[PDB]
Design a protein around this ligand. Structure first.
Ligand SMILES: [Mg+2]
Ligand SMILES: [Mg+2]
Lengths: 169, 169
């Protein structure tokens, strides 16, 4: 059976995946780079994966309003506002914001994975983590096309270099 | 030819119609009352009408990002945040917010109509105004179904009572 603390992590990840979908839809609509629309769709899949686990355990869904930008945990509301404002400044800053959210996602997924032995909760967290590694590689390669790069913020420098120096999984 | 001041009014109305669409899509997604989805669609039509005039005169569109909640004029950003928070409290408060935005829209359309002799700009402002009267009647009748009513904020009491005491146009 699921612990109260394990429930808290699914409730955070539910909205954390929604932060990524909503910022990437918002930055698609500003810059019309296909990467944001494609990765947004992947984040909608990740949101649906967390929702399936919330419904499995009948945990109340923190997403009471699917609209872009709406969050129950104000951590994610603050991140949405900060990151859409930064991403609005240029294509390069929007792509950096892409990488930033995946970086956060990987760091937070490692924290929650280390708090659980439930193999079903772990399959999903590991899958989401692999997705965020792939997405990070895609945002960083597109940053390189614009003559830029990315400095990790939440994961370690060692882990970031392991991700970017390896191929899409 | 269009004046600088007439251009300013189309630029404000472009986003004012977007405020109504975006708040009503946000409140649809919270409460799932069909009125919000139906009227949102009408507001998308009103946004497109203003856009046609902006493109006729090659005026830069203040909507650089169609995403819900994004605005160039921070008047509309502040109104969006205030009104989605109020509308989140109950169905009655969401329906009051419906009426509030139409009320504002009618008051602002009267201000801009009185600033112009361009008959093309006026056909559109009058049509939009008629739409907002109709929408107001619909939100107030739905408020009545919930045992509530609406107090006008921007238009006069006399004008509000003329609108609600008459039939859909
Ligand atoms: Mg994700
Ligand atoms: Mg309208």
């Amino acid at each position: 059976p699921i612990s109260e603390e394990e429930k808290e992590g699914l409730i955070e990840m539910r909205e954390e995946e929604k932060l990524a979908r909503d910022v990437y839809l918002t930055l698609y609509n500003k810059w019309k780079l296909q990467i944001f629309k494609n990765i947004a769709e992947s984040e909608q899949t990740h949101m649906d994966a967390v929702k399936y686990l919330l419904e499995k355990y009948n945990i109340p869904d923190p997403v009471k309003n699917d609209s872009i930008g709406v969050f129950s945990n104000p951590k994610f509301e603050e991140l949405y506002k900060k990151l859409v404002e930064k991403g609005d400044k240029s294509e390069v800053d929007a792509l950096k914001v892409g990488a930033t959210i995946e970086d956060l996602d990987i760091a937070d997924l490692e924290k929650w994975i280390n708090k659980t032995d439930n193999e079903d909760i772990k399959f999903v967290y590991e899958n989401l983590m692999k997705g965020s590694r792939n997405h990070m590689r895609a945002f960083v390669r597109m940053l390189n096309n614009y003559g830029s790069n990315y400095t990790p913020q939440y994961i370690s420098k060692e882990e970031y270099e392991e991700i970017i120096s390896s191929s899409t999984e």
